[PDB]
Amino acid sequence: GDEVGALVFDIGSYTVRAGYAGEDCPKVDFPTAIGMVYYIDTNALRVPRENMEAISPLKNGMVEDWDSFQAILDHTYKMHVKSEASLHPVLMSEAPWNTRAKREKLTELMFEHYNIPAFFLCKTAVLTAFANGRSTGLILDSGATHTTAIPVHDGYVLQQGIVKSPLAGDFITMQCRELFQEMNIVTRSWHNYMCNCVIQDFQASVLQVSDSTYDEQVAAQMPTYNCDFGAERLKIPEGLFDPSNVKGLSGNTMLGVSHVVTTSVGMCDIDIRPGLYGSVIVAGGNTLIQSFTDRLNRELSQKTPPSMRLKLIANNTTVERRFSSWIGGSILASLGTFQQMWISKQEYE
Amino acid sequence: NSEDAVMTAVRAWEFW
Amino acid sequence: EGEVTELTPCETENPMGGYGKTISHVIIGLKTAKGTKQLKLDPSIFESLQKERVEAGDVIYIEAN
Amino acid sequence: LLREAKITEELNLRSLETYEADKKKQVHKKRKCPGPIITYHSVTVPLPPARCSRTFITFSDDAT
Amino acid sequence: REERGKKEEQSRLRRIAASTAREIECFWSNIEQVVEIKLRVTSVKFNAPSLLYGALRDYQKIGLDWLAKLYRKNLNGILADEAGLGKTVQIIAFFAHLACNEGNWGPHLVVVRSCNILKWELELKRWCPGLKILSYIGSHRELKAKRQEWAEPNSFHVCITSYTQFFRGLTAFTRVRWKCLVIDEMQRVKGMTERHWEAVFTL
Ligand SMILES: Nc1ncnc2c1ncn2[C@@H]1O[C@H](COP(=O)(O)OP(=O)(O)O)[C@@H](O)[C@H]1O
Incomplete structure (x- = not known):
């Protein structure tokens, strides 16, 4: 029953869920659609600024625009998580069937830009x-x-x-x-x-x-x-x-x-x-x-x-x-296997 | 009934 | 007796139980001066093999019973 | 309807009052296992009826 | 060798996933076990046996038959039989027959001594289980929470009340209508000078 304080994310098609592990309810919940002219929040949904295009990082259940993914992840880590993204594991929630290239790109982008010490992802059906x-x-x-x-x-x-x-x-x-x-x-x-x-x-x-x-x-x-x-x-x-x-x-x-x-x-x-x-x-x-x-x-x-x-x-x-899915992901990082079966910082390097 | 299927699978493995 | 060439053919987990990784047989490649003859011995002996320093290239003295 | 509702309700109450498991203790023993546990398992298998004994050795992880 | 290596990699991934699944399931099972441990600890005779799981004896069935005239003829009498014959089982069978024959359930009341409340509800759950019953404890605070689902909804069809609790809440029980008012061991109801008489009369 050890807890390290991992942030479990879930990039949904309608609302993105995020929050610290060990909770029974997602602390973060807001629309996932990104409004680019580049605002991603309920404020973006409300603010009637200059001409804005409403799109989402997910397309047919697969991340296509990596720029929007990076933007939403940064916005979350900055405003919602209100904590630096370098001393907290991450439990990403991929699609029901994720591809090799997509997972490789996600892991590379994470370990390069965010330098997360521990990053692991699993299916959504198993989490549920x-x-x-x-x-x-x-x-x-x-x-x-x-x-x-x-x-x-x-x-x-x-x-x-x-x-x-x-x-x-x-x-x-x-x-x-x-x-x-x-x-x-x-x-x-x-x-x-x-x-x-x-x-x-x-x-x-x-x-x-x-x-x-x-x-x-x-x-x-x-x-x-x-x-x-x-x-x-x-x-x-x-x-x-x-x-x-x-x-x-x-x-x-x-x-x-x-x-x-x-x-x-x-x-x-x-x-x-x-x-x-x-x-x-x-x-x-x-x-x-x-x-x-x-x-x-x-x-x-x-x-x-x-x-x-x-x-x-x-x-x-x-x-x-x-x-x-978010509840499963959150309760997942409260076990002993979190230390046994997991991806450390020096497995891919 | 479950044990019957289990022993049938064991026999199939033996034949394999 | 003969020079040993240890190898464990991977086999499906115990069919009576669940799945996983098991070993139903352990093949030892005893090589003698006259020729070679692999023996598909019982897997329970694997403990004895690991007990002594039985590495590929040494002579072992097996017993039938 | 309400009849089956009350039936199931009192059945649950009776189950609770009568609950006043070994499988759970076995699962706890499994929990306490560090994880690289090798199991020696031998069972009788067919060829009283003609039969024979078969031996199996399950390895938990690839480390062992 | 190549195909076996591919299959072995697939099997290793499968086994790692299965181990993680077993671990999470075992932790969830521990949590559920802890939660459950904390929570838990000229006489026509034709009766229907529907919902009568508890086996009844011959004389018990005969007594049930003799008493069918009361509900059918709208009569009331005393049931004075020597202890050990299970009058509670007879009343439970009567409550079950009232539903097996007619579709009316109504809200019922049963007055039981303080030292016999648990016994009566246990017997109810044992003989002819299917029913909705509620207990009466904590006249100060606990009962107030239980009396928040009685007016509009028929949360329970039978109630096991106590003698001492009626006298402090007469203003509450006299409001709701009731069909059957069972009272056992009337020895405590043999003194006219007691206030229990006028308290139970207006029901
Ligand atoms: N790609 C997805 N995979 C699984 N679930 C999703 C996905 N996209 C959205 N969802 C969930 O499905 C919901 C769809 O919302 P919607 O059904 O319109 O709300 P409601 O029907 O409750 O008014 C969203 O709230 C979202 O969390």
């Missing part, structure tokens, strides 16, 4: 599994840029059974747009960013998932101007699980959350599928939708082989599910 308190399981993450069913066995991502669907930040940023326009309505990038923000607010406010196939529903009102929305709010979320249910705006084929889970479990080797089915874990931001886990559970039960247990984690009530 550790946060939930289980080694074997099936992580069902739905982030702002991708949703993936990552089967983990003994805290290691089974790269052979990974899957992915187009469910990303484009979930309702443009569907809810037309849904609202049905009744009625600094650069273009900033306008799109503000539109996405207000659409996410509308989502967290009224968007709800049904328990079964789409059906009539009473209307609900909410400000933005005020309007009363009928069952329209219950239509778009249907596309997350069943493609046949959404027949008009879901193309010809689509791997829903349930179908994604089934495919991920089927692609895995024998002797481990029972453990995966028994312990199913959900993650991401889209899981916060109302009645999401309920529909997921009551639907996966139908698409479940006989005598196969299905016991998920009932943590959706708490908002910390989205930060499960």
Whole structure:
């Protein structure tokens, strides 16, 4: 139970999490989108300065603009961490499947510019599994840029059974747009960013998932101007699980959350599928939708082989599910293996 | 039942 | 007896348990004046091999039973 | 509904009151292990029924 | 040699990841164990056995049958049987049948002596477990926290109260409606000069 004071970072697509190890809640949380003319903070989101382009370091779940990554890391170490970045280990949280070149570039940039004495990174599925308190399981993450069913066995991502669907930040940023326009309505990038923000607010406010196939529903009102929305709010979320249910705006084929889970479990080797089915874990931001886990559970039960247990984690009530990765990373640097299994300062040199 | 699968895997390893 | 050429063919962990690293057999390359003959002895003897200074290039006196 | 709710609630209460494990102690023993533990393991395997003995030696880390 | 080296590198990475996973899982298990240790320490006879896990005896079932007339005919009588026959089990079976037959649960009350509170809730959890029961301790502070989920919600269908606690909170129990008011060992309720009579009358 030794603690050295490591700063665990997690570069998310919607909000970056950071804070000292040994905490049960991310102390740092703010939008990750960088506004370059070069301001990265909630202030940047608020300040209406000269023409600004809204972009993010992550693209399809992979860091593309290293300049923005360096900028956000420096801004964090300067204002949020309020401590010099030369006497504190770092536990980076990469993507579900990171590449050799990306990890090499990250390690090189770190050890060169920041001179971190100890830098280590691990998968996100394993971190979430550790946060939930289980080694074997099936992580069902739905982030702002991708949703993936990552089967983990003994805290290691089974790269052979990974899957992915187009469910990303484009979930309702443009569907809810037309849904609202049905009744009625600094650069273009900033306008799109503000539109996405207000659409996410509308989502967290009224968007709800049904328990079964789409059906009539009473209307609900909410400000933005005020309007009363009928069952329209219950239509778009249907596309997350069943493609046949959404027949008009879901193309010809689509791997829903349930179908994604089934495919991920089927692609895995024998002797481990029972453990995966028994312990199913959900993650991401889209899981916060109302009645999401309920529909997921009551639907996966139908698409479940006989005598196969299905016991998920009932943590959706708490908002910390989205930060499960950060919780796992923080609790990771409080063990004895932190000194045994770790990358020191003279391993790469 | 688990022990049955375990011994079957052991027999498969022996044949290998 | 004969000049030893120790080598342990890596084998999958105990199939009855989990995974990892185990050794199911230990091959010793006893080389005699007439020729060479590798013996796939029991792995439990590995302790005896490490006990004495049994390095590649020396003569060892093995016992059947 | 509320019926199954109360059923599960009192079942949990009964489990708690009756809990008034060896596997946990074995896991603790494992914790205390420095880590480079070599395990001598031999089990009976088939070729009473005809069978034979097989020996296995598991090495924790590559150092050993 | 090349392919075996590649496979061995992959297996070594797998094993390092598995060791880290085992370590973190063991630490989480220790934390959970510590948390759990800190937290824990002309007589129709047709009865339904649904939710009756505790086995009942023949005479117990017969007694249950004889007393079915009370609830069905809206009658009340005294149950004076020699100790050792388990009247608590009979009342538990009655509460279970009230739900097995009709869909009405309602909020119930059971008056038990101070030295018999734990015994009664233990028996309830043992015989016919499925139920919602609450205890009454700490009349000053603890009860105040428990009385914050009774008005609007039906957090519990049965309550195990004590005699001495009623007289200090009559203004609270008389507000909520109740269906069954069980009182055991009426020997303490045989003196008219006591104030318990008028206190329990207005229920
Ligand atoms: N690349 C990613 N991988 C995993 N999770 C992500 C990723 N990007 C964003 N997330 C999480 O998903 C959430 C998406 O936000 P959103 O679902 O719109 O909020 P809400 O639905 O609660 O209104 C973000 O809060 C973010 O933390």
